[PDB]
Write a protein that binds this ligand. Sequence first.
Ligand SMILES: O=C(O)c1ccnc2cc(-c3nc4ccccc4n3CCN3CCCCC3)sc12
Ligand SMILES: [Mn+2]
Length: 294
Amino acid sequence: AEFVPPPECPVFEPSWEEFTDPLSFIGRIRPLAEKTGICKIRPPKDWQPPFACEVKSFRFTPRVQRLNELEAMFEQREYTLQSFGEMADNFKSDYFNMPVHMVPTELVEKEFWRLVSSIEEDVIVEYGADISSKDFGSGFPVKDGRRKILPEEEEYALSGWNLNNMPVLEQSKVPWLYVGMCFSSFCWHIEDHWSYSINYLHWGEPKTWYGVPSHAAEQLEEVMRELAPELFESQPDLLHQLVTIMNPNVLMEHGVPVYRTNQCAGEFVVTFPRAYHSGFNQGYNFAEAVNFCT
Ligand SMILES: O=C(O)c1ccnc2cc(-c3nc4ccccc4n3CCN3CCCCC3)sc12
Ligand SMILES: [Mn+2]
């Protein structure tokens, strides 16, 4: 039948007192959030960092994504932020025959998973994924000198929730940028070294997430290995994770607990250690993410 949305993951709305430092806050929500794999954090209403990327010079060549590439078993355009947004909005409004902001998030979700398994329709999108923040700057203001920081921006340049200020060292990395369009996606994966990840949506349409708690990681990997094609089943996990696309209902039918969320502009998503996650974008948006350890 049609897609059944997984239950919603926890959403936290901390006060200014609880919003003091992300490390301590993540530590306190851990008893609940680690049981759901992912969680969403809404900052206080007055916490609004200004977008600090060099929009004039922001040029990139996104990667081509064919939604049904696994069910089928020549694709190779430079955009600006503006020209990519025009292409993205035109694609979505043309696909759904309605203004982009009027398409329900549930409809994009059900259509995405239908297209992923559809053998009759071949939908192709583009994703500006894994763009280094060293190339055109971070979405957050930073004390760098390459871009002037206004007095109203210094608070955000020094904020602990600025992803450039996260601790990224283990015991013995820069944020990445993601320019999304409708149906652009990332498949199921965990982070290197089982690290945390934190993801901020600077602006645009929501990013839809799916998460699995770490206690079900082995269960997910066994389901993924049982249903993956024989050519990819024996591949190392770092390589298999490039094509690990799977409908969440298939995991839920095999007893895997899965949670979902729509990450809206200005909201954080935190993934916990060894919490498998995947998702897709509802439309033209801009996200920034970094891995960190506690
Ligand atoms: O799209 C989001 O918003 C999002 C949210 C959470 N996790 C992820 C992971 C993503 C991803 N797609 C890939 C396609 C090919 C190869 C690697 C890919 N990777 C991980 C990239 N990884 C290693 C290289 C440097 C950057 C970090 S996209 C994404
Ligand atoms: Mn990730």
